[PDB]
Each structure stands twice: as C-alpha cells, then as structure tokens.
C-alpha cells in the first residue's frame, strides 16, 4: 500500500502524485531524531544522552524537513519501479503544503522515454 | 537544593539559586504531556499527540514558562528554608539559560527590620 | 479565561487574556496550604505554623508565583485553542493587579511567515 496516482499530461509528459501517511512520517522523524541525538553533547552529560524533548525542540523542524525530502524521493523511486515508469532526465518535485502531524501529498513531473525505435 | 544567600545593604538581600537541569526537564516533560492531551490534529485521534511534534512546536514556549515557574517556586522554597521573607517586590536577575543545562539566577529584595 | 487574538503589524500578534478573580484566589489558597506544609518557623513544628502567619509572611510571594503560573498556563491553553503558533518565545505584558479582582494581561509574539 502507498497511495499513488499516475497521470498523462501532454506528449511524453507524466505526473505522479503521492500521499505519505502521517504515521510513516512520524516514524521516520523519530528514528532520525534518535540518530541526531547520538551526535549532540551538552555539558551536563556525556555525548548521546540528551533528552529527546530537547533534541526534538531544537532539531525537530530541520529533521522533519530532511525526512519529508527523503520520503518524497524514496517513494517516487519505489513508485516508478512498481508502475514501470521510465523517466527521462531529471524529474521535478512539486511539493504540496505540509501540515504538522498530517498526511502529506506531492507530485513529481517528468517526461518518459519514447519507445526505442530501430 | 543549591542556594546562596548574600546579606545586608540597608535591609537589602540577594538570593542566588541554581536549578538542576533534570528538575527543569521533568517540569518541561510534564507540561508537554499536558499539551499533547489538549492539542487536536486533523485526521489524528489515536491517543495523545506524539511528543516530538509537541516538543518542536511548543517546546520553546513551554520551556520559557517552566523557567519562570521554577524561578518562582525555588525562590519561595529557599526563603522558607532560610526562615525569612521579603518586604517588597522581589527583583529577579536571571543568568544565561543554556538548553539542557543547570540554570542560575538571583533574587533581590528587602526584609522587615528586627532586633 | 477570556481570550482575544489580534494582529499588531506584520507577523506580530497580541493575545489578550483575562483571568477570573476566584481562579486566582483558589490557586493562592491551595499553594498557601502547600507552603504551610513545608514551613517550620516561629517556634512551631513543621506544618503547624498558623495560617495567619504563613499568609502574613508568604502571602505576597505566593500571589506573585500564582499569577505568573496562571499567566503561562492560560497563554498556552489559549494559543492551542486559537491554533496560533509563536515563532519564538512570547513576551508577557501584565496589566495592573488589584487584589481580589480579575486580571487582564497581553502576550506578544510573531508567527511564522506563510510558506507560499
């Protein structure tokens, strides 16, 4: 399951629209934050033992951004493999609005390769 | 409790206090949990809002309120232990706050004359 | 808790909140009861100091403590209900406090700009 929509725009053009579930995002942000916690040190303790509420407060927004970008990319690649879509050149990511704690939808626009003619 | 009491200057007095970082985190966590029970997020109903979300959005605000609450509570706990009390409005002189670190501050005020 | 939210200028916002007089009195009385439990002074065993003495000595400090606490909790409750998110740390602007009366104060801060 993923929630993917394919569209034909014009000519060799296509558009893939994907919605990432809020819980998938939260799970990703969670593990990324624990990895980031391993890198932070604060006088009062030894590196890596910083309280999660502190790491989330300070790095949550940046990490949430990183994760969104990463998930958009990974889900797109999985989508074209499953849908057997062959992009030509570099695709363009068209992100939707992101609402904290909610599902996230975006589109990816690109041209595909025409059938190899010999 | 780590308290320091300077004394005298025409009844004037100064109490410097240092709050444990852990004490700070416990208050913050409790407040954030309260917040997670009140926040409503569209499409989400499975229990309280995740803490990473709450800490990110409400962390700075909740932590500032918790620092003010603790400065006050600890000053009171301090004077109760030092068997003394202010005569006028106390002046809070905060030190630098460093995320996740012990916090130190001072409180200046006067006491009623005795013999 | 009466709440009024308004724009000042640009991303600046002001939330004005009024705290009921008895919400304050109830909180003050409760904290005074807990302070009495901790106090051992003026010849009395711990927790047995007459309330008139506890009030005369720590009433003012308790009042200050409770007001600050109520201002914070009421602000947070307010931004949650109004669904407005401060970009940084909020600035409190208290009104004048009249013992036994309602208390109105304002909180100023900026919101994040629209992503657009």
mmCIF file of C-alpha atoms in Angstrom:
data_model
loop_
_atom_site.group_PDB
_atom_site.id
_atom_site.type_symbol
_atom_site.label_atom_id
_atom_site.label_comp_id
_atom_site.label_asym_id
_atom_site.label_seq_id
_atom_site.Cartn_x
_atom_site.Cartn_y
_atom_site.Cartn_z
ATOM 1 C CA UNK A 1 0.000 0.000 0.000
ATOM 2 C CA UNK A 2 1.251 3.528 -0.771
ATOM 3 C CA UNK A 3 -1.368 5.836 -2.350
ATOM 4 C CA UNK A 4 -0.004 6.639 -5.832
ATOM 5 C CA UNK A 5 -1.725 8.306 -8.815
ATOM 6 C CA UNK A 6 -0.306 8.414 -12.328
ATOM 7 C CA UNK A 7 -1.344 10.947 -14.948
ATOM 8 C CA UNK A 8 -0.531 11.659 -18.555
ATOM 9 C CA UNK A 9 -0.047 15.373 -19.004
ATOM 10 C CA UNK A 10 0.936 16.113 -22.554
ATOM 11 C CA UNK A 11 3.059 14.205 -25.049
ATOM 12 C CA UNK A 12 5.711 12.159 -23.249
ATOM 13 C CA UNK A 13 4.825 14.001 -20.049
ATOM 14 C CA UNK A 14 3.592 12.357 -16.871
ATOM 15 C CA UNK A 15 2.803 13.235 -13.295
ATOM 16 C CA UNK A 16 2.957 11.011 -10.258
ATOM 17 C CA UNK A 17 1.029 12.149 -7.202
ATOM 18 C CA UNK A 18 1.787 10.521 -3.864
ATOM 19 C CA UNK A 19 0.402 10.870 -0.349
ATOM 20 C CA UNK A 20 2.629 9.898 2.574
ATOM 21 C CA UNK A 21 0.755 8.835 5.694
ATOM 22 C CA UNK A 22 1.248 10.915 8.806
ATOM 23 C CA UNK A 23 2.404 7.898 10.816
ATOM 24 C CA UNK A 24 5.077 6.981 8.253
ATOM 25 C CA UNK A 25 6.449 10.480 8.517
ATOM 26 C CA UNK A 26 6.387 10.469 12.295
ATOM 27 C CA UNK A 27 8.127 7.106 12.471
ATOM 28 C CA UNK A 28 10.872 8.393 10.154
ATOM 29 C CA UNK A 29 11.297 11.633 12.068
ATOM 30 C CA UNK A 30 11.516 9.616 15.280
ATOM 31 C CA UNK A 31 14.446 7.412 14.237
ATOM 32 C CA UNK A 32 16.251 10.279 12.555
ATOM 33 C CA UNK A 33 15.963 12.260 15.772
ATOM 34 C CA UNK A 34 17.449 9.379 17.802
ATOM 35 C CA UNK A 35 20.401 9.310 15.393
ATOM 36 C CA UNK A 36 20.784 13.061 15.706
ATOM 37 C CA UNK A 37 20.697 12.652 19.487
ATOM 38 C CA UNK A 38 23.836 10.486 19.261
ATOM 39 C CA UNK A 39 25.706 13.431 17.820
ATOM 40 C CA UNK A 40 24.743 16.056 20.368
ATOM 41 C CA UNK A 41 26.594 16.861 23.566
ATOM 42 C CA UNK A 42 25.519 19.233 26.359
ATOM 43 C CA UNK A 43 27.863 19.980 29.294
ATOM 44 C CA UNK A 44 25.586 18.349 31.875
ATOM 45 C CA UNK A 45 26.169 14.899 30.376
ATOM 46 C CA UNK A 46 28.173 12.636 28.082
ATOM 47 C CA UNK A 47 27.563 12.758 24.328
ATOM 48 C CA UNK A 48 24.408 10.961 23.220
ATOM 49 C CA UNK A 49 22.431 11.105 26.477
ATOM 50 C CA UNK A 50 20.452 14.287 25.706
ATOM 51 C CA UNK A 51 16.682 14.143 26.492
ATOM 52 C CA UNK A 52 14.560 13.615 23.373
ATOM 53 C CA UNK A 53 12.308 16.596 24.149
ATOM 54 C CA UNK A 54 15.388 18.816 23.874
ATOM 55 C CA UNK A 55 16.543 17.325 20.547
ATOM 56 C CA UNK A 56 13.037 17.500 19.110
ATOM 57 C CA UNK A 57 12.661 21.109 20.243
ATOM 58 C CA UNK A 58 15.943 22.195 18.705
ATOM 59 C CA UNK A 59 16.322 19.858 15.689
ATOM 60 C CA UNK A 60 12.796 18.633 15.022
ATOM 61 C CA UNK A 61 11.926 21.198 12.330
ATOM 62 C CA UNK A 62 15.171 20.708 10.400
ATOM 63 C CA UNK A 63 14.963 16.906 10.677
ATOM 64 C CA UNK A 64 11.271 16.882 9.725
ATOM 65 C CA UNK A 65 12.246 18.821 6.610
ATOM 66 C CA UNK A 66 15.083 16.402 5.831
ATOM 67 C CA UNK A 67 12.717 13.406 6.267
ATOM 68 C CA UNK A 68 9.979 14.879 4.068
ATOM 69 C CA UNK A 69 12.507 15.418 1.290
ATOM 70 C CA UNK A 70 13.939 11.926 1.770
ATOM 71 C CA UNK A 71 10.500 10.226 1.759
ATOM 72 C CA UNK A 72 9.344 12.137 -1.322
ATOM 73 C CA UNK A 73 12.409 10.796 -3.163
ATOM 74 C CA UNK A 74 12.237 7.200 -1.886
ATOM 75 C CA UNK A 75 8.505 6.880 -2.523
ATOM 76 C CA UNK A 76 8.921 8.241 -6.023
ATOM 77 C CA UNK A 77 11.629 5.709 -6.887
ATOM 78 C CA UNK A 78 9.564 2.862 -5.462
ATOM 79 C CA UNK A 79 6.529 4.158 -7.396
ATOM 80 C CA UNK A 80 8.176 4.208 -10.819
ATOM 81 C CA UNK A 81 9.639 0.751 -10.247
ATOM 82 C CA UNK A 82 6.167 -0.576 -9.361
ATOM 83 C CA UNK A 83 4.395 1.365 -12.117
ATOM 84 C CA UNK A 84 7.138 0.568 -14.625
ATOM 85 C CA UNK A 85 7.694 4.222 -15.471
ATOM 86 C CA UNK A 86 10.964 5.277 -17.089
ATOM 87 C CA UNK A 87 11.740 8.985 -16.557
ATOM 88 C CA UNK A 88 13.912 10.920 -18.960
ATOM 89 C CA UNK A 89 16.320 13.397 -17.455
ATOM 90 C CA UNK A 90 15.726 14.846 -14.021
ATOM 91 C CA UNK A 91 12.157 14.840 -12.647
ATOM 92 C CA UNK A 92 10.678 17.929 -10.988
ATOM 93 C CA UNK A 93 9.282 17.637 -7.471
ATOM 94 C CA UNK A 94 6.169 19.722 -6.803
ATOM 95 C CA UNK A 95 5.505 19.625 -3.015
ATOM 96 C CA UNK A 96 2.084 20.300 -1.523
ATOM 97 C CA UNK A 97 1.581 22.248 1.700
ATOM 98 C CA UNK A 98 2.896 20.461 4.761
ATOM 99 C CA UNK A 99 0.667 20.485 7.848
ATOM 100 C CA UNK A 100 2.330 19.289 11.068
ATOM 101 C CA UNK A 101 1.215 15.802 12.068
ATOM 102 C CA UNK A 102 -0.907 15.338 8.932
ATOM 103 C CA UNK A 103 -0.688 13.274 5.725
ATOM 104 C CA UNK A 104 1.485 14.865 3.049
ATOM 105 C CA UNK A 105 0.829 14.939 -0.723
ATOM 106 C CA UNK A 106 3.157 15.952 -3.531
ATOM 107 C CA UNK A 107 3.555 15.461 -7.260
ATOM 108 C CA UNK A 108 6.534 14.683 -9.434
ATOM 109 C CA UNK A 109 6.530 15.849 -13.065
ATOM 110 C CA UNK A 110 8.688 14.406 -15.808
ATOM 111 C CA UNK A 111 8.971 13.183 -19.392
ATOM 112 C CA UNK A 112 9.353 9.471 -20.054
ATOM 113 C CA UNK A 113 11.459 7.928 -22.802
ATOM 114 C CA UNK A 114 9.563 7.206 -26.031
ATOM 115 C CA UNK A 115 9.675 3.604 -27.201
ATOM 116 C CA UNK A 116 13.150 2.743 -28.505
ATOM 117 C CA UNK A 117 12.752 2.868 -32.296
ATOM 118 C CA UNK A 118 15.167 0.996 -34.530
ATOM 119 C CA UNK B 1 18.689 22.428 46.706
ATOM 120 C CA UNK B 2 21.685 24.622 45.855
ATOM 121 C CA UNK B 3 21.156 28.089 47.383
ATOM 122 C CA UNK B 4 23.452 31.025 48.196
ATOM 123 C CA UNK B 5 22.388 33.940 50.421
ATOM 124 C CA UNK B 6 24.215 37.265 50.462
ATOM 125 C CA UNK B 7 23.046 39.655 53.158
ATOM 126 C CA UNK B 8 22.820 43.343 54.141
ATOM 127 C CA UNK B 9 22.725 46.742 52.385
ATOM 128 C CA UNK B 10 20.193 48.633 54.477
ATOM 129 C CA UNK B 11 17.957 45.569 54.897
ATOM 130 C CA UNK B 12 18.564 44.570 51.271
ATOM 131 C CA UNK B 13 19.341 40.946 50.404
ATOM 132 C CA UNK B 14 20.201 38.697 47.457
ATOM 133 C CA UNK B 15 19.490 35.010 46.996
ATOM 134 C CA UNK B 16 21.261 33.188 44.182
ATOM 135 C CA UNK B 17 19.774 29.864 43.200
ATOM 136 C CA UNK B 18 20.744 27.118 40.766
ATOM 137 C CA UNK B 19 18.119 24.770 39.349
ATOM 138 C CA UNK B 20 19.130 21.249 38.362
ATOM 139 C CA UNK B 21 18.823 20.607 34.632
ATOM 140 C CA UNK B 22 16.970 17.405 35.425
ATOM 141 C CA UNK B 23 14.470 19.283 37.525
ATOM 142 C CA UNK B 24 13.908 21.507 34.513
ATOM 143 C CA UNK B 25 13.393 18.606 32.139
ATOM 144 C CA UNK B 26 10.890 16.887 34.444
ATOM 145 C CA UNK B 27 8.714 20.045 34.562
ATOM 146 C CA UNK B 28 9.019 20.565 30.802
ATOM 147 C CA UNK B 29 8.059 16.924 30.111
ATOM 148 C CA UNK B 30 5.002 17.142 32.362
ATOM 149 C CA UNK B 31 3.842 20.341 30.694
ATOM 150 C CA UNK B 32 4.461 18.940 27.204
ATOM 151 C CA UNK B 33 2.394 15.879 28.127
ATOM 152 C CA UNK B 34 -0.415 18.156 29.235
ATOM 153 C CA UNK B 35 -0.134 19.946 25.884
ATOM 154 C CA UNK B 36 -0.237 16.638 23.999
ATOM 155 C CA UNK B 37 -3.626 15.944 25.638
ATOM 156 C CA UNK B 38 -5.103 19.279 24.562
ATOM 157 C CA UNK B 39 -3.768 19.662 21.018
ATOM 158 C CA UNK B 40 -6.105 18.451 18.239
ATOM 159 C CA UNK B 41 -4.646 17.451 14.894
ATOM 160 C CA UNK B 42 -6.919 16.842 11.909
ATOM 161 C CA UNK B 43 -7.025 13.190 10.832
ATOM 162 C CA UNK B 44 -5.443 12.032 14.106
ATOM 163 C CA UNK B 45 -7.447 10.580 17.026
ATOM 164 C CA UNK B 46 -5.319 7.651 18.243
ATOM 165 C CA UNK B 47 -4.375 8.896 21.688
ATOM 166 C CA UNK B 48 -2.307 11.933 22.553
ATOM 167 C CA UNK B 49 -0.253 13.849 20.003
ATOM 168 C CA UNK B 50 3.305 12.465 19.594
ATOM 169 C CA UNK B 51 5.868 14.166 21.835
ATOM 170 C CA UNK B 52 8.266 15.007 19.036
ATOM 171 C CA UNK B 53 5.532 17.098 17.464
ATOM 172 C CA UNK B 54 4.657 18.789 20.749
ATOM 173 C CA UNK B 55 8.310 19.451 21.700
ATOM 174 C CA UNK B 56 9.014 21.019 18.248
ATOM 175 C CA UNK B 57 6.026 23.359 18.165
ATOM 176 C CA UNK B 58 5.533 24.133 21.832
ATOM 177 C CA UNK B 59 8.958 23.413 23.274
ATOM 178 C CA UNK B 60 10.411 26.934 23.391
ATOM 179 C CA UNK B 61 7.224 28.460 24.818
ATOM 180 C CA UNK B 62 6.622 25.731 27.397
ATOM 181 C CA UNK B 63 10.284 25.802 28.456
ATOM 182 C CA UNK B 64 10.211 29.561 28.945
ATOM 183 C CA UNK B 65 7.103 29.282 31.111
ATOM 184 C CA UNK B 66 8.650 26.413 33.077
ATOM 185 C CA UNK B 67 11.788 28.500 33.726
ATOM 186 C CA UNK B 68 9.654 31.323 35.121
ATOM 187 C CA UNK B 69 7.554 28.966 37.242
ATOM 188 C CA UNK B 70 10.648 27.268 38.724
ATOM 189 C CA UNK B 71 12.499 30.521 39.443
ATOM 190 C CA UNK B 72 9.452 31.491 41.481
ATOM 191 C CA UNK B 73 8.864 28.139 43.173
ATOM 192 C CA UNK B 74 12.509 27.768 44.113
ATOM 193 C CA UNK B 75 12.796 31.264 45.488
ATOM 194 C CA UNK B 76 9.851 30.501 47.787
ATOM 195 C CA UNK B 77 11.278 27.114 48.784
ATOM 196 C CA UNK B 78 14.506 28.995 49.502
ATOM 197 C CA UNK B 79 13.147 31.689 51.831
ATOM 198 C CA UNK B 80 11.006 29.094 53.635
ATOM 199 C CA UNK B 81 14.183 27.179 54.404
ATOM 200 C CA UNK B 82 16.057 30.377 55.291
ATOM 201 C CA UNK B 83 13.264 31.390 57.723
ATOM 202 C CA UNK B 84 12.954 34.814 56.069
ATOM 203 C CA UNK B 85 10.560 36.713 53.851
ATOM 204 C CA UNK B 86 10.531 39.729 51.502
ATOM 205 C CA UNK B 87 9.042 43.073 52.483
ATOM 206 C CA UNK B 88 8.748 44.358 48.952
ATOM 207 C CA UNK B 89 8.502 43.150 45.377
ATOM 208 C CA UNK B 90 11.465 40.863 44.580
ATOM 209 C CA UNK B 91 13.771 41.583 41.621
ATOM 210 C CA UNK B 92 14.693 38.572 39.528
ATOM 211 C CA UNK B 93 18.168 38.675 37.966
ATOM 212 C CA UNK B 94 18.433 35.714 35.569
ATOM 213 C CA UNK B 95 21.699 34.283 34.361
ATOM 214 C CA UNK B 96 22.282 32.849 30.910
ATOM 215 C CA UNK B 97 19.967 29.964 30.078
ATOM 216 C CA UNK B 98 21.592 27.137 28.175
ATOM 217 C CA UNK B 99 19.305 24.443 26.796
ATOM 218 C CA UNK B 100 19.624 21.293 28.875
ATOM 219 C CA UNK B 101 21.989 22.854 31.437
ATOM 220 C CA UNK B 102 21.610 23.944 35.077
ATOM 221 C CA UNK B 103 20.136 27.391 35.411
ATOM 222 C CA UNK B 104 21.313 30.019 37.861
ATOM 223 C CA UNK B 105 19.603 33.265 38.867
ATOM 224 C CA UNK B 106 19.355 35.810 41.657
ATOM 225 C CA UNK B 107 16.533 37.471 43.568
ATOM 226 C CA UNK B 108 16.988 40.823 45.312
ATOM 227 C CA UNK B 109 14.548 42.134 47.887
ATOM 228 C CA UNK B 110 14.336 43.688 51.336
ATOM 229 C CA UNK B 111 13.344 42.268 54.724
ATOM 230 C CA UNK B 112 11.390 43.806 57.623
ATOM 231 C CA UNK B 113 13.616 45.319 60.354
ATOM 232 C CA UNK B 114 14.084 43.218 63.518
ATOM 233 C CA UNK B 115 16.116 43.435 66.731
ATOM 234 C CA UNK C 1 -10.321 32.841 30.737
ATOM 235 C CA UNK C 2 -11.442 35.431 28.168
ATOM 236 C CA UNK C 3 -9.261 35.368 25.033
ATOM 237 C CA UNK C 4 -8.803 37.954 22.321
ATOM 238 C CA UNK C 5 -6.327 37.490 19.462
ATOM 239 C CA UNK C 6 -5.315 40.289 17.120
ATOM 240 C CA UNK C 7 -2.632 41.354 14.645
ATOM 241 C CA UNK C 8 -0.387 44.234 15.653
ATOM 242 C CA UNK C 9 1.662 44.696 12.485
ATOM 243 C CA UNK C 10 3.300 42.322 10.017
ATOM 244 C CA UNK C 11 3.759 38.901 11.620
ATOM 245 C CA UNK C 12 3.179 40.491 15.014
ATOM 246 C CA UNK C 13 0.304 39.257 17.117
ATOM 247 C CA UNK C 14 -1.162 40.093 20.501
ATOM 248 C CA UNK C 15 -3.213 37.787 22.663
ATOM 249 C CA UNK C 16 -5.133 39.459 25.467
ATOM 250 C CA UNK C 17 -6.327 37.235 28.311
ATOM 251 C CA UNK C 18 -8.404 37.911 31.426
ATOM 252 C CA UNK C 19 -8.093 35.595 34.409
ATOM 253 C CA UNK C 20 -11.075 35.277 36.746
ATOM 254 C CA UNK C 21 -10.579 36.626 40.260
ATOM 255 C CA UNK C 22 -11.552 33.431 42.020
ATOM 256 C CA UNK C 23 -9.374 31.253 39.778
ATOM 257 C CA UNK C 24 -6.605 33.285 41.298
ATOM 258 C CA UNK C 25 -7.915 33.063 44.871
ATOM 259 C CA UNK C 26 -8.432 29.328 44.684
ATOM 260 C CA UNK C 27 -4.912 28.806 43.368
ATOM 261 C CA UNK C 28 -3.467 31.142 46.001
ATOM 262 C CA UNK C 29 -5.269 29.340 48.805
ATOM 263 C CA UNK C 30 -4.129 25.937 47.542
ATOM 264 C CA UNK C 31 -0.500 26.945 47.286
ATOM 265 C CA UNK C 32 -0.611 28.595 50.710
ATOM 266 C CA UNK C 33 -1.851 25.265 52.105
ATOM 267 C CA UNK C 34 1.130 23.509 50.491
ATOM 268 C CA UNK C 35 3.598 26.152 51.672
ATOM 269 C CA UNK C 36 2.329 25.716 55.224
ATOM 270 C CA UNK C 37 3.122 22.007 54.971
ATOM 271 C CA UNK C 38 6.763 22.863 54.242
ATOM 272 C CA UNK C 39 7.281 25.605 56.836
ATOM 273 C CA UNK C 40 8.811 25.137 60.285
ATOM 274 C CA UNK C 41 9.134 28.588 61.798
ATOM 275 C CA UNK C 42 8.393 30.871 64.726
ATOM 276 C CA UNK C 43 8.527 28.103 67.330
ATOM 277 C CA UNK C 44 6.093 25.770 65.558
ATOM 278 C CA UNK C 45 6.708 22.182 64.389
ATOM 279 C CA UNK C 46 6.875 21.727 60.603
ATOM 280 C CA UNK C 47 3.448 22.145 59.025
ATOM 281 C CA UNK C 48 1.899 23.535 62.217
ATOM 282 C CA UNK C 49 2.556 27.221 61.670
ATOM 283 C CA UNK C 50 -0.711 29.208 61.954
ATOM 284 C CA UNK C 51 -2.074 30.112 58.572
ATOM 285 C CA UNK C 52 -2.302 33.760 59.557
ATOM 286 C CA UNK C 53 1.477 33.705 60.000
ATOM 287 C CA UNK C 54 2.060 31.746 56.771
ATOM 288 C CA UNK C 55 -0.111 34.282 54.918
ATOM 289 C CA UNK C 56 1.436 37.310 56.584
ATOM 290 C CA UNK C 57 4.944 36.056 55.684
ATOM 291 C CA UNK C 58 4.473 34.367 52.319
ATOM 292 C CA UNK C 59 1.125 35.578 51.013
ATOM 293 C CA UNK C 60 2.644 38.208 48.718
ATOM 294 C CA UNK C 61 5.255 35.843 47.265
ATOM 295 C CA UNK C 62 2.617 33.166 46.758
ATOM 296 C CA UNK C 63 0.380 35.676 44.956
ATOM 297 C CA UNK C 64 3.204 36.652 42.645
ATOM 298 C CA UNK C 65 4.064 32.965 41.997
ATOM 299 C CA UNK C 66 0.456 32.038 41.263
ATOM 300 C CA UNK C 67 -0.111 34.984 38.874
ATOM 301 C CA UNK C 68 2.943 34.122 36.804
ATOM 302 C CA UNK C 69 1.853 30.459 36.719
ATOM 303 C CA UNK C 70 -1.707 31.305 35.691
ATOM 304 C CA UNK C 71 -0.455 33.730 33.009
ATOM 305 C CA UNK C 72 1.692 30.983 31.422
ATOM 306 C CA UNK C 73 -0.844 28.180 31.570
ATOM 307 C CA UNK C 74 -3.616 30.409 30.265
ATOM 308 C CA UNK C 75 -1.479 31.618 27.356
ATOM 309 C CA UNK C 76 -0.546 28.112 26.279
ATOM 310 C CA UNK C 77 -4.164 26.985 26.574
ATOM 311 C CA UNK C 78 -5.170 29.994 24.503
ATOM 312 C CA UNK C 79 -2.746 29.528 21.592
ATOM 313 C CA UNK C 80 -3.730 25.867 21.455
ATOM 314 C CA UNK C 81 -7.437 26.685 21.219
ATOM 315 C CA UNK C 82 -6.900 29.593 18.778
ATOM 316 C CA UNK C 83 -4.484 27.406 16.815
ATOM 317 C CA UNK C 84 -1.825 30.089 16.520
ATOM 318 C CA UNK C 85 1.868 29.165 16.742
ATOM 319 C CA UNK C 86 4.520 31.579 18.141
ATOM 320 C CA UNK C 87 7.698 31.711 16.074
ATOM 321 C CA UNK C 88 9.826 32.191 19.166
ATOM 322 C CA UNK C 89 9.480 32.941 22.860
ATOM 323 C CA UNK C 90 6.421 35.065 23.828
ATOM 324 C CA UNK C 91 6.620 38.390 25.663
ATOM 325 C CA UNK C 92 4.313 38.921 28.630
ATOM 326 C CA UNK C 93 2.842 42.324 29.305
ATOM 327 C CA UNK C 94 0.880 42.265 32.574
ATOM 328 C CA UNK C 95 -1.844 44.757 33.349
ATOM 329 C CA UNK C 96 -2.289 46.182 36.853
ATOM 330 C CA UNK C 97 -3.134 43.692 39.591
ATOM 331 C CA UNK C 98 -5.919 44.565 42.021
ATOM 332 C CA UNK C 99 -6.164 42.093 44.862
ATOM 333 C CA UNK C 100 -9.370 40.058 44.665
ATOM 334 C CA UNK C 101 -10.148 41.412 41.184
ATOM 335 C CA UNK C 102 -9.963 39.917 37.669
ATOM 336 C CA UNK C 103 -6.590 40.066 35.900
ATOM 337 C CA UNK C 104 -6.033 41.034 32.279
ATOM 338 C CA UNK C 105 -2.686 40.849 30.520
ATOM 339 C CA UNK C 106 -1.334 40.626 26.982
ATOM 340 C CA UNK C 107 1.182 38.369 25.324
ATOM 341 C CA UNK C 108 3.056 39.469 22.222
ATOM 342 C CA UNK C 109 4.986 37.381 19.712
ATOM 343 C CA UNK C 110 5.437 36.770 15.956
ATOM 344 C CA UNK C 111 4.079 33.880 13.935
ATOM 345 C CA UNK C 112 5.959 32.148 11.164
ATOM 346 C CA UNK C 113 5.572 33.659 7.680
ATOM 347 C CA UNK C 114 3.426 31.796 5.140
ATOM 348 C CA UNK C 115 5.350 29.184 3.109
ATOM 349 C CA UNK C 116 3.782 30.273 -0.204
#
